[PDB]
Design a protein around this nucleic acid. Structure first.
Length: 65
DNA sequence: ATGAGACGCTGGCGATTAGCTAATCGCCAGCGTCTCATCTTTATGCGCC
C-alpha cells in the first residue's frame, strides 16, 4: 500500500529532495497523460555521476600519511 | 337667479470645509553553545555469469 504520493514521502534522506521528486514525477505523469495517454518510446534522464580519472581520484582520496 | 381660473437668481464664482492614497527609498531582519547517541552516504582500494 503506497499511493502515487506517500511512497515519495517514504523515501530515505532529506525533505529537500521530496519536493523536487514530487514535482518531476507529477510532470512525467502529466506528459504521458497528454500525448495520447500512451507510453512514449524512450525517456532520457541526466545523472550526476561522471567518470573521473584514476590519478585524480586516487590523489584526492590519498590517506593523509 | 355667480364668483374661479393665470405662483421666485441661479450660476458662477470664492471659499470654505473635508479628506486621502501613492511613489521612493531605506532598514533590517533572534542567535550562542555543548553533550549524547543514532544511522546513512561519498573518494580510493577486490570478484564474470
Amino acid at each position: 500500500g503506497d499511493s502515487l504520493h506517500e511512497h515519495i514521502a517514504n523515501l530515505a534522506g532529506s525533505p529537500a529532495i521530496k519536493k523536487g521528486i514530487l514535482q518531476t514525477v507529477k510532470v512525467v505523469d502529466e506528459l504521458v497523460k497528454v500525448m495520447g495517454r500512451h507510453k512514449p518510446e524512450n525517456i532520457v534522464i541526466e545523472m550526476a555521476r561522471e567518470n573521473q580519472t584514476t590519478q585524480k581520484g586516487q590523489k584526492n582520496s590519498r590517506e593523509r600519511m
